[PDB]
C-alpha cells in the first residue's frame, strides 16, 4: 500500500531502505472458463521480493561529472562539424547524450532557451528565496529549467512494479477485481470528486473544512480494503456490519 505508484492507487513512497515483501503477498488468483487458477511471481528460487532502493537508482556525483565532461566535449565536436556542414543538431545526433551532463542536454532543446540566457545569478536567487517564501525548498541548490533534471525515477518505478508482482500482483490487494472492469487499460482516476472539489470554495468553517480534507483517505482505505482489513494484519476479534 505504501510503495505502489500513485497511478495504481498506492502512495508512491520512495524507499531509502531495506524492505522485504513477504512471498504470501506475491500470490493472486483469476477465474476463467476452466475454473480458478492461482499465480505467483517469483519463479526463480530466490529470497522474498525486495523492493528497489532509491540507493541504487541515483548516479554518483563523480561519475556524473565525468559523464558531463565527456558529453560536453562530444557536443562541442558535434557543433563544430555542424557549423562546417551548415546544419544544426537535430535532436537525433544528440541521442546517445540526452540526460548526462550537469547542464543536462535537455536544456539545449528547451523551448524557453532564449529568455533563460538572460537569467543571471539564478542559483544565488534560488538560495535566497528562503527569505521570501514560507516553505523550505529541498532543491535550493539547483533549477530545473537552468540545470536540467539531474535524476530519473523511470527505472525505480519500473523495478518497483516488477518487485511487487506487476499489475496483477498489486491489484489483488485492491478492490479492483470488485469493480469488474474487464481490463486495466482504459481506466483513469478522478483525484477530486465533482462535488468534493466544488466545496473547496464555499465558505466552510474550520471544523467543516478539516473533515472535508479527509475525504480522499476514505477512498484510499477503500482501494486497499482487501489488504488493510485482514485477520493477519489486525489480530483480534472481528465485528460484522449490521446489514
Amino acid at each position: 500500500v505504501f510503495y505502489t505508484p500513485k497511478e495504481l492507487g498506492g502512495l508512491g513512497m520512495l524507499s531509502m531502505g531495506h524492505v522485504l515483501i513477504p512471498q504470501s503477498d506475491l500470490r493472486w488468483s483469476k477465474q476463467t472458463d476452466v475454473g480458478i487458477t492461482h499465480f505467483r511471481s517469483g519463479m526463480s528460487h530466490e529470497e522474498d521480493q525486495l523492493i528497489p532502493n532509491l540507493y541504487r537508482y541515483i548516479q554518483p556525483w563523480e561519475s556524473e561529472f565525468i559523464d558531463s565532461q565527456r558529453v560536453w566535449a562530444e557536443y562541442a565536436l558535434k557543433r563544430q562539424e555542424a557549423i562546417a556542414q551548415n546544419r544544426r543538431l537535430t535532436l537525433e545526433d544528440l541521442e546517445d547524450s540526452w540526460d548526462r551532463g550537469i547542464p543536462r542536454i535537455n536544456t539545449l532543446f528547451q523551448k524557453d532557451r532564449h529568455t533563460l540566457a538572460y537569467d543571471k545569478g539564478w542559483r544565488v536567487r534560488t538560495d535566497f528565496k528562503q527569505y521570501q517564501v514560507l516553505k523550505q525548498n529541498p532543491f535550493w541548490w539547483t533549477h530545473q529549467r537552468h540545470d536540467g533534471k539531474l535524476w530519473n525515477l523511470n527505472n525505480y518505478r519500473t523495478d518497483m512494479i516488477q518487485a511487487l508482482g506487476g499489475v496483477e500482483g498489486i491489484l489483488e490487494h485492491t478492490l479492483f477485481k470488485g469493480t469488474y472492469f474487464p481490463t486495466w487499460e482504459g481506466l483513469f482516476w478522478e483525484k477530486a470528486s465533482g462535488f468534493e472539489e466544488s466545496m473547496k470554495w464555499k465558505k466552510l468553517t474550520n471544523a467543516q473544512r478539516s473533515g472535508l480534507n479527509q475525504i480522499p483517505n476514505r477512498r484510499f482505505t477503500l482501494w486497499w480494503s482487501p489488504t488493510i482489513n485482514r485477520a493477519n494484519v489486525y489480530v483480534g476479534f472481528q465485528v460484522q456490519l449490521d446489514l
Binding site: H18, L20, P52, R56, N155
Partner: peptide, 22 residues
C-alpha cells in the same frame, strides 16, 4: 514479513550506487 523498513547499514553494501541506472 513485518513490512518495517530495516536499516541497510552493512546491508546491500556489496553493490555500487551505479547499478540499475541508465
Amino acid at each position: 514479513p513485518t513490512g518495517e523498513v530495516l536499516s541497510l547499514v552493512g546491508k546491500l553494501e556489496g553493490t555500487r550506487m551505479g547499478d540499475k541506472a541508465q
